[PDB]
Design a protein around this ligand. Sequence first.
Ligand SMILES: CCCCCCCCCCCCCCCC(=O)O
Length: 133
Amino acid sequence: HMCDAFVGTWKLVSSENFDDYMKELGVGFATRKVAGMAKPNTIISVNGDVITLKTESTFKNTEISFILGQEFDEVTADDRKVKSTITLDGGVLVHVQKWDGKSTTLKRKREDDKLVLELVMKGVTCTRVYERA
Ligand SMILES: CCCCCCCCCCCCCCCC(=O)O
């Protein structure tokens, strides 16, 4: 029952500082424009110990499957080749990506009826709020 509160289909409702976050990742002008326009859905499912997280939009579709604590190689929506580990820390799903001496964190928490995604790179924090579809 590790991740029960996260399971389902979620839709983006608000975004704060995403452009700045994408700049910190090195995302170029055209991609930042088209990515910022996106209204994704995030679909989280669980089969035993395997969690699947899909992110679907008109810009890109991504899909990762993982076991908590077990590192995996990920190719992100902006085409970074990263080493990823996802853990549950006190009810928060913490996703760390490492590449090229750099790191970013993607943390997901349940707050009221929302799924709140915090993206942090260096000094920059973006918050993406999702609600159930
Ligand atoms: C997948 C639709 C959003 C578009 C992102 C594509 C270009 C930038 C990718 C940025 C890093 C991944 C950000 C996660 C954002 C989110 O799940 O809401």
